[PDB]
């Protein structure tokens, strides 16, 4: 039976893990100590001999403090001390440290824990891996465990949630480096990746939910809502259940184009939801708006390639089909010449669950959208621009050189990203 494994890496990964597992335990009714008071949870939560449920998660970080917070938190007895793995020294925003010196001592134990938990799993559906490209840990360690995980299990789907660096705001000076040097792993070793930036969520929180001071927990809660909406088809029954492999095969047409886009609807506060009627046409017209994109890219400058819609709640296929047609017969939303059929609707039953202390208003229906489209290439091109402006002066190179990366890999990775943007253009080329 279908099984998920969560492989969260770095501080961003473990905080997303806190959010998502809090949402999952509340959704299934699991107490923080770990018992249902009163088998959809067997995708994530496995029984013990004492009648208590444990999650299929591994949180790894090369600094101990953030995970020690969870070890001392209210969920101290929900996770295992074994699935929480810490490092005495961290990468400190250095892909070389994250990939060749500190990752070597611990990739074996990480693989051991993953192997044990996969052995616990009977039918393993796949891997969801949560990390960030800016962080040295979340880039280098994730890349090396990616390299080893593919050769340990070639056939299992390896889906990536990752925090893309935002176009104007960043939290480092040397993050474009690690962003570039993780693209090799994320290109040759990922079947589909879900880069998000925090700036678009900041705009969404200012823009829809009226909250004028969100902290990291609010963006983390939105990402947790995204992943729950993704996996709702596995977890609960529905009319059109869409597991991982369906939407991955119908979102990836070419091996080197596996970079779709997340979108959620509806995102609105209680005060605003009390006055606004919500329908399938409402939420899908909200989905097809550039102002609601979780990345700073305008798809009016890009060519839609494949859209996967996940409806959830009191949804009716009539409303879905009328929605899809009232998306198709509009000139502002364009579709590529070789993709006349371009939509992937899956239907679930269970309406979204609102967490206390949350921000999202309780709604009866929701929709998630995963759109492969070509407008994303401009972000890689901007990252190329900043990488070239750094490499021309050869800044910060000595750290990597002394840690044990050869400098020609920098030029190789620049060439790789150039090839990727070139073949994105090649796919955008018309088929007449």
């Amino acid at each position: 039976m279908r099984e998920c494994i969560s492989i969260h890496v770095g501080q961003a990964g473990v905080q997303i893990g806190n959010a998502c597992w809090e949402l999952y335990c509340l959704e299934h009714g699991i107490q923080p100590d770990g018992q249902m008071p009163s088998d959809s949870f067997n995708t994530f939560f496995s029984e013990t001999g004492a009648g208590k449920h444990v999650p299929r998660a591994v949180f790894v970080d090369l600094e101990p403090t953030v995970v020690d917070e969870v070890r001392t938190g209210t969920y101290r007895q929900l996770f295992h001390p074994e699935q929480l793995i810490t490092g005495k020294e961290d990468a400190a925003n250095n892909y070389a440290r994250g990939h060749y010196t500190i990752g070597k001592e611990i990739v074996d134990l990480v693989l051991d824990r993953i192997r044990k938990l996969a052995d616990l799993c009977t039918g393993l559906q796949g891997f969801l891996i949560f990390h960030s490209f800016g962080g040295g840990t979340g880039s280098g360690f994730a890349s090396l465990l990616m390299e080893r995980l593919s050769v340990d299990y070639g056939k299992k789907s390896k889906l990536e949630f990752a925090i893309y660096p935002a176009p104007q705001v960043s939290t480092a000076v040397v993050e474009p480096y690690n962003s570039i040097l993780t693209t090799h792993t994320t290109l040759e070793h990922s079947d589909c990746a879900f880069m998000v930036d925090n700036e678009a969520i900041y705009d969404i929180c200012r823009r829809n939910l009226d909250i004028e001071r969100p902290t990291y927990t609010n963006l983390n809660r939105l990402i947790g809502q995204i992943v729950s909406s993704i996996t709702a088809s596995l977890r609960f029954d529905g009319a059109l259940n869409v597991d991982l492999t369906e939407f991955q095969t119908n979102l990836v047409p070419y091996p080197r184009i596996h970079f779709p886009l997340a979108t959620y609807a509806p995102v609105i506060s209680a005060e605003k939801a009390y006055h606004e009627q919500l329908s399938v046409a409402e939420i899908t017209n909200a989905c097809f708006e550039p102002a609601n994109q979780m990345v700073k890219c305008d798809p009016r400058h890009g060519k839609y390639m494949a859209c996967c819609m996940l409806y959830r709640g009191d949804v009716v296929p009539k409303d879905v089909n009328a929605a899809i047609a009232t998306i198709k017969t509009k000139r502002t939303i364009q579709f590529v010449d070789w993709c006349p059929t371009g939509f992937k609707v899956g239907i679930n039953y269970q309406p979204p669950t609102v967490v206390p202390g949350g921000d999202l208003a309780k709604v009866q229906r929701a929709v998630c959208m995963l759109s492969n489209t070509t407008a994303i290439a401009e972000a890689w091109a901007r990252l190329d621009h900043k990488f070239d402006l750094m490499y021309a002066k050869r800044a910060f190179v000595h750290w990597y050189v002394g840690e044990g990366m050869e400098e020609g890999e920098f030029s190789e990775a620049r060439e790789d990203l150039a090839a990727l943007e070139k073949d994105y253009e090649e796919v955008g080329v018309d088929s007449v």
Binding site: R300, H301, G302, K303, R331, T332, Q334, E378, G428
Partner: protein
């Protein structure tokens, strides 16, 4: 390139205000039932200056502020392959072309157009925003040449107060200031305040005062004292006004408050 615009009936033609990455092509429309001027921006071919670090600044000024004698754009839309057009209102002629039609404009109608454009310049500076680009080619008039509308809001900045001074030196030498060209920090309001001086001067004199041929000698000349072409008759309060708009001291020139209310313009 133009397929999305062709679906909306936007077959433009009539190239006015030609440029590498900006044109003023007259268009035809079906929704607005008439003609619109189209301004193109090439987001990839053009340099980053326009494309990044200044692009939202220009477009936000083209989004929010409303006034009778300013730009009033209808919408911004674009064809997919990485371009940028601008759907702007009806336009007739900028001021330099109309100047050359007769050589100059007599003072009676001139103070009429100047009171209109000085009246417009009041409104820009009250809203904590600056233009830093005023030029006869960007002073777009009416078909009957009785109204003014400045355009090319390309150097906007959220200017607030004196304690912070602008460091960016952006300006064409024909309508420039030494504090732009002599490399000293300046008050953003005062640089625009002088942009009226050359605009008023060129429109009536028929020639700009100094010589935009040498970058270095122009400030040294500019302290000689501004001189008007011989045979041209103006008003004494306007002889003053040009002298208090082209003087070397930064803040000795009148600000927007006094440039608003002048004796000759009120007359």
């Amino acid at each position: 390139g133009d397929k999305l615009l062709s679906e909306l009936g936007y077959k433009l033609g009539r190239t006015i205000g030609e440029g590498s990455y900006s044109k003023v092509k007259v268009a035809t429309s079906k929704k607005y039932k008439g003609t619109v001027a189209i301004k193109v921006v090439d987001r990839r071919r053009a340099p980053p200056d326009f494309v990044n670090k200044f692009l939202p600044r220009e477009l936000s000024i083209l989004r929010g502020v409303r006034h009778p004698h300013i730009v009033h754009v209808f919408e911004f839309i674009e064809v997919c392959n990485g371009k940028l057009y601008i759907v702007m209102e009806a336009a007739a002629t900028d001021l330099l072309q109309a100047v050359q039609r007769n050589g100059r404009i007599p003072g009676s109608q001139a103070r009429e157009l100047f009171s209109q454009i000085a009246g417009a310049v009041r409104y820009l500076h009250d809203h904590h925003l600056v233009h830093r680009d005023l030029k006869c080619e960007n002073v777009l008039l009416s078909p009957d040449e009785r109204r003014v509308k400045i355009t090319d809001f390309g150097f906007g900045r959220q200017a607030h107060g004196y304690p912070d001074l602008s460091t960016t030196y952006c300006g064409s030498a024909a309508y420039a200031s030494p504090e732009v060209l002599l490399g000293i920090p300046y008050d953003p309001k005062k640089y625009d305040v002088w942009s009226l001086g050359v605009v008023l001067y060129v429109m009536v004199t028929g020639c700009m005062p100094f010589d935009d041929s040498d970058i270095a000698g122009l400030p040294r000349r500019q302290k000689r004292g501004v001189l008007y072409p011989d045979g041209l008759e103006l008003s004494e309060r306007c002889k003053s006004l040009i002298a208090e708009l082209l003087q070397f001291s930064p803040s000795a020139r009148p600000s927007a408050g006094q440039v608003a209310r002048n004796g000759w313009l009120r007359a």
